Amino acid sequence: NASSQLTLLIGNLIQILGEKSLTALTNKITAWKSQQQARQQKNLEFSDKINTLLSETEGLTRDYEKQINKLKNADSKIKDLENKINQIQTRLSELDPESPEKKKLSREEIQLTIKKDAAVKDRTLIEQKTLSIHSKLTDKSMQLEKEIDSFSAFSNTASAEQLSTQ
């Protein structure tokens, strides 16, 4: 709307002062409008690109939280199993040799160790997925940086006066 007030203003000034007497001002006004329109367009593109990056970052955060919570439950399960296995092994060490209680206990230690081995392989998978999401978030932060550098490149060279003056 500054652009349309300007258009009224210069038109009124020409009505009295004369068109050729205001040529240089008219041309400066034309340049101002063109630069304004170019910046508005870049702002709109910038705002939409940021909106999409925020959505993509949100989506990756959701995946990340999902994995982190999986990792917490894997860590807990594993600690519990290691704890029960250490306790069975303490009991086992205390048996006089010719024992029948060894049978039940070693059976139990075997079955726990199978479960723990499986939980450790799962933990390892979750750790792997969690790092890949982390690195995708890193890619996004760097795409955001490229868009900021892109905007600053445009903004600092958008006018002729900008290029001629230090």
What letter does residue 100 receive in the DSSP assignment?
Answer: S
Tell me how far apart the alpha carbons of residues 141 and 61 are, in angstroms, rounded to a whole number. 13
Taking the CA atoms of residue 94, residue 99, residue 101 and residue 104 in that order, the dihedral angle to the nearest 10 degrees is 110
CATH T-level assignment (fold) for domain 1-166? Four Helix Bundle (Hemerythrin (Met), subunit A) (1.20.120)
Q: Experimental method used, please?
A: X-ray
Instruction: Identify the CA nearest to 81 among candidates 117, 36, 112.
Output: 112
Tell me how far apart the alpha carbons of residues 17 and 73 are, in angstroms, rounded to a whole number. 81
One-letter amino acid for residue 36 of the chain: Q
Residues 6+ apart with CB under 8 A from 6: 29, 32, 33
Tell me how far apart the alpha carbons of residues 10 and 3 are, in angstroms, rounded to a whole number. 11
Tell me how far apart the alpha carbons of residues 66 and 62 are, in angstroms, rounded to a whole number. 6
Q: Please tell me what resolution, in angstroms, this structure has.
A: 2.1
Q: Where do the structural domains in the chain lie, given as residue ranges?
A: 1-166
